[PDB]
């Protein structure tokens, strides 16, 4: 019976590939061939945030493009004032091995997790004047990879075990579980409408989930190695991924295909972070090489390079207004970059 | 300061107090030594941490930590639990530990090659190149019984054992048969050959022959960490 099921799966995959090929009438690079080049993107380190003792794994921006949060393996969360380089908060964690950060869109809560299979939520605005842990979510059986807030009472997590979960913070229970991948889910991106989200796992595939229905909609399977980063196009109709192989790729929700690859012969390292510009024409990716490359989304070209850090770049984010880019790295320093 | 409002000055003062607390945390972070304990299900590292506990919890607990002191030096050992088989992703979090403690059950030859492949992967990893390995070849009494019985043979799984002869320069334990010494030296030589095949300059392996009754493993870890720190100091102080 197994052989018949495998044959049926092969036939279904073949017909899906045929359907995808039928829609590939033209390439993205062909259409954007006559478009004007972006030019050269020069950026300078406006601020450098110091104070972490160990390497930084994650950072997140506040909805007001002024406040940050960052995690290090010292077991510490620091909230920064990016304008004045002031440390607003410093939160000690129970477990040193923290892998991810999240900032609530309202700004009242911050979450984190790591090798301990728990997501801990902290109340930033209490009447006692201190930051205290509000809830511990303890359902995953593997290390916690990514966290993303939906509201003050909803959060989506991806974990080392193949599942992803949606939680109710007040009750502390898994409202939904997403069980499609066959490897460690490494990244997670929320859609602008927050009705869908995408994930990239340690297989070469990415999946589009429905938050309310709690089921997978599409699979994209374009890379060659483990996917480490994922991000949404600002339109919400496309997304980009970074993988252990040197390439970065742009995928399309509506056409169910892959649009363009961002690779060069001199790059033989893996991409750790991926982010888009506010207009969507610039793609920023961090690398195992200690630099960060700016890419032209419409035409696969390297517009500029961010060459400040002297260790592996681990995290990367762009503010909601598109004013600045923050880059974290394994040398325990954060840098804010801006144009001219 | 100039062009700062009173609230701005108070915020700067709060940030400075936070930095002071961060420095106080940094001193303690620098004091202690962090170790990562690895092994298989038959290695017996549970007994090793049990005997480290002499020196002084959710069901899905991702990491177990034990602490102990040798000569007023604090050690933090981290044991991985409730994790999946794939280690390629969560092993990168331990790229700054002082040393890796690898525990091997040398009694059974069926899974010795699996341990050798694990050692190869740990030694040759890109992010674990700097880390030194303290190798414990556990269960010496069981191996001695297995080699005295004569029922099981090492040449079945390692054909080069017949061509191996124990070195003329050796330090066998008193009352130990030559066959036990030959088996132990061959088993250790496999791991030592793997270690010295590449990357000998950056990091060093420290092989030991331990057992369940042995109570000197803490001192061995202390001495090996002392040597690791000595080598790091030689590198840092422009001596080399």
């Amino acid at each position: 019976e197994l052989d018949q099921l495998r044959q049926e799966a092969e036939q279904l995959k073949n017909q899906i590939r045929d359907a995808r090929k039928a829609c590939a009438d033209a390439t993205l690079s062909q259409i954007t061939n006559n478009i004007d080049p972006v030019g050269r993107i020069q950026m300078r380190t406006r601020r450098t945030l110091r104070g972490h003792l160990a390497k930084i794994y994650a950072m997140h921006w506040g909805t007001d493009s002024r406040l940050l949060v960052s995690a290090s393996q010292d077991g510490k969360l620091i909230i920064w004032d990016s304008y004045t380089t002031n440390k607003v908060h410093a939160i000690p964690l129970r477990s040193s091995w923290v892998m991810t950060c999240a900032y609530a869109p309202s700004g009242n809560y911050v979450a984190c997790g790591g090798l301990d299979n728990i997501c801990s939520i902290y109340n930033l605005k209490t009447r006692e004047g201190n930051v205290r842990v509000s809830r511990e979510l303890a359902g995953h059986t593997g290390y916690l990879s990514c966290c993303r807030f939906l509201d003050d009472n909803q959060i989506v997590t991806s974990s080392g075990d193949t599942t992803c979960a949606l939680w109710d913070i007040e009750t502390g229970q898994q409202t939904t579980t997403f069980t499609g991948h066959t490897g460690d889910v490494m990244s997670l991106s929320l859609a602008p409408d927050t009705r869908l989200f995408v994930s990239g796992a340690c297989d070469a595939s990415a999946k589009l989930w429905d938050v309310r229905e709690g089921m997978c909609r599409q699979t994209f399977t374009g890379h060659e190695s483990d996917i480490n980063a994922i991000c949404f196009f600002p339109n919400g109709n496309a997304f980009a991924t970074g993988s252990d192989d040197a390439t970065c790729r742009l995928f399309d929700l509506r056409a169910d295909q892959e649009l363009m690859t961002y690779s060069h012969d001199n790059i033989i390292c893996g991409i750790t972070s991926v982010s888009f510009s506010k207009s969507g024409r610039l793609l920023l990716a961090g690398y195992d090489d200690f630099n960060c490359n700016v890419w032209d989304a419409l035409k696969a070209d390297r517009a500029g390079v961010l060459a400040g850090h002297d260790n592996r770049v681990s995290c990367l984010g762009v503010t909601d207004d598109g004013m600045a880019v923050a880059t974290g790295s394994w040398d325990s320093f954060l840098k804010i970059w801006n144009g001219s | 300061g100039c062009t700062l409002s009173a609230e701005d000055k108070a915020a700067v003062e709060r940030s400075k107090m936070i930095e002071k607390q961060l420095q106080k945390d940094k001193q303690v972070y620098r004091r202690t030594l962090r170790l990562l304990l690895l092994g298989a299900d038959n290695s017996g590292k549970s007994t090793i941490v049990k005997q480290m506990r002499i020196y002084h919890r959710v069901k899905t607990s991702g990491i177990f930590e034990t602490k102990f002191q040798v000569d007023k030096v604090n050690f933090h050992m981290f044991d991985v639990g409730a994790q999946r088989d794939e280690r390629r992703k969560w092993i990168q979090c331990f790229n700054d530990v002082t040393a890796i403690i690898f525990v091997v059950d040398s009694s059974d030859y069926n899974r010795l090659q699996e341990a050798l492949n694990d050692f190869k992967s740990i030694w040759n990893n890109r992010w674990l190149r700097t880390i030194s390995v303290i190798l414990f070849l556990n269960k010496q009494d069981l191996l001695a019984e297995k080699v005295l019985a004569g029922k099981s043979k090492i040449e079945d799984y390692f054909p080069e054992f017949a061509r191996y002869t124990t070195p003329e320069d050796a330090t066998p334990e008193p009352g130990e048969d030559p066959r036990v010494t030959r088996a132990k030296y061959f088993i250790r030589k496999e791991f030592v050959d793997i270690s010295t095949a590449s990357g000998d300059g950056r990091h060093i392996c420290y092989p030991h022959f331990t057992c369940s009754v042995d109570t000197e493993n803490a001192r061995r870890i202390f001495n090996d960490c002392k040597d690791i720190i000595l080598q790091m100091n030689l590198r840092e102080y422009n001596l080399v």
Partner: single-chain antibody
Amino acid sequence: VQLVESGGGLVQPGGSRKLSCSASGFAFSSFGMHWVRQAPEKGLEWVAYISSGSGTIYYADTVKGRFTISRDDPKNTLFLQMTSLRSEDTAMYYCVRSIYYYGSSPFDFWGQGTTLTVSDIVMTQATSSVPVTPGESVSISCRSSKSLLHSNGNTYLYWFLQRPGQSPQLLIYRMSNLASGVPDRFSGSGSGTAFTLTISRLEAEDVGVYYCMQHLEYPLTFGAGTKLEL
């Protein structure tokens, strides 16, 4: 959160007194503390300030050489040692919390106050008494001698309400932000020099005296107080 003041009473016009402020329910060591006094049938008047760490200390010009402020963080107690007490030192002294970071709400909790009896930007509140009835809209205005707007963009204007027989309660901080626990009917606005406070629907709970304070520079100065009465 609770602040309880101790000390105060009949003191000679040459004696010395020590006031204590016992704090519980919050992280005392991470808050700056102020002393504010209100003379009998008069308005508020800032006295002293000690920061979260004891590095920064400020005093009003009238009490600079005689008063001293100190805190005992393990005991969660705030002190005020007073010497050479004069007849104009007769007032009710309050204990006020203040925490400063990006987006905080200083001057949020006041103590119950202790009474003592001894045997600069100018803030103008033109109105003194106003007759109101429940279910109406009223506006309370104030003016500043110096422009309160800063290069940061903040204005640093605060509004307080002191109900009959109670301690002041913060309403609006930095001229527009509404304090937690305050109803949405209160609104704050104004220019860089002239400001106004609006109440949409009056209640019997809103009757009291309203003060305006500036936090642009030290010393901190208050207004005369606009009294809403039925």
